[PDB]
Amino acid sequence: PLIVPYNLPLPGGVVPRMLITILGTVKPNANRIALDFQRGNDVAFHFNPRFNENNRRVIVCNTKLDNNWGREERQSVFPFESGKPFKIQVLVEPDHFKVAVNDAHLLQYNHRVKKLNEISKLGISGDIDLTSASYTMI
Ligand SMILES: O=S(=O)(c1ccccc1)c1cn([C@H]2[C@@H](O)[C@@H](CO)O[C@@H](S[C@@H]3O[C@H](CO)[C@@H](O)[C@H](O)[C@H]3O)[C@@H]2O)nn1
Ligand SMILES: [Mg+2]
């Protein structure tokens, strides 16, 4: 078990066919989780499950450039549950990130930040017990 917030180095950034796996358990009374694929201070891909935005559960995705959030993309399919173990897999493809949770496709996020080999850190934060974070080439 790792302490959050956690930084996973991504030296050489990301590349198509790279699969990033995040394993953890949602805390009781969770409010939010965040994955931040970073290029320096910019956030190429922010993946933000919100457990209680107006008594609604929603996943918010966005990009932060020069400290300004862009236009959100939202997903109401919500596979995470307080108290339960999860696996997030982020598959890098040429035109988008493809996200699966617990082996089920969840969403895609088109690349806004185009320099993938400079997205050199993944930050993992929020209301989880983080077991592990790693990647491979499939
Ligand atoms: O790491 S965190 O989870 C996090 C860290 C510490 C405590 C809690 C969470 C975390 C989330 N955030 C951001 C990020 O999620 C961003 C994505 O678009 O959304 C904004 S809220 C956004 O505000 C708009 C007005 O400007 C409003 O128009 C819009 O409707 C509404 O969605 C978030 O504040 N930064 N850090
Ligand atoms: Mg497409």
Swiss-Prot record:
GO terms for molecular function: carbohydrate binding; chemoattractant activity; disaccharide binding; IgE binding; laminin binding; molecular condensate scaffold activity; protein phosphatase binding; protein phosphatase inhibitor activity. GO terms for cellular component: cell surface; collagen-containing extracellular matrix; cytoplasm; cytosol; extracellular exosome; extracellular region; extracellular space; ficolin-1-rich granule membrane. One of its GO terms (biological process) is positive chemotaxis. Signal peptide: none annotated. Residues 6-136 form the Galectin domain. A beta-D-galactoside binds at residues 69-75. A major expression is found in the colonic epithelium. It is also abundant in the activated macrophages. Expressed in fetal membranes. Its main location: cytoplasm. The modification Phosphoserine is found at residue 76. It is found in: Cytoplasm; Nucleus; Secreted. A motif (Nuclear export signal) lies at residues 114-129. Keywords: Acetylation, Cytoplasm, Differentiation, Disulfide bond, IgE-binding protein, Immunity, Innate immunity, Lectin, mRNA processing, mRNA splicing, Nucleus, Phosphoprotein, Repeat, Secreted, Spliceosome. Probably forms homo- or heterodimers. Interacts with DMBT1. Interacts with CD6 and ALCAM. Forms a complex with the ITGA3, ITGB1 and CSPG4. Interacts with LGALS3BP, LYPD3, ZFTRAF1 and UACA. Interacts with TRIM16; this interaction mediates autophagy of damage endomembranes. Interacts with cargo receptor TMED10; the interaction mediates the translocation from the cytoplasm into the ERGIC (endoplasmic reticulum-Golgi intermediate compartment) and thereby secretion. Galactose-specific lectin which binds IgE. May mediate with the alpha-3, beta-1 integrin the stimulation by CSPG4 of endothelial cells migration. Together with DMBT1, required for terminal differentiation of columnar epithelial cells during early embryogenesis. In the nucleus: acts as a pre-mRNA splicing factor. Involved in acute inflammatory responses including neutrophil activation and adhesion, chemoattraction of monocytes macrophages, opsonization of apoptotic neutrophils, and activation of mast cells. This is Galectin-3. It comes from Homo sapiens.
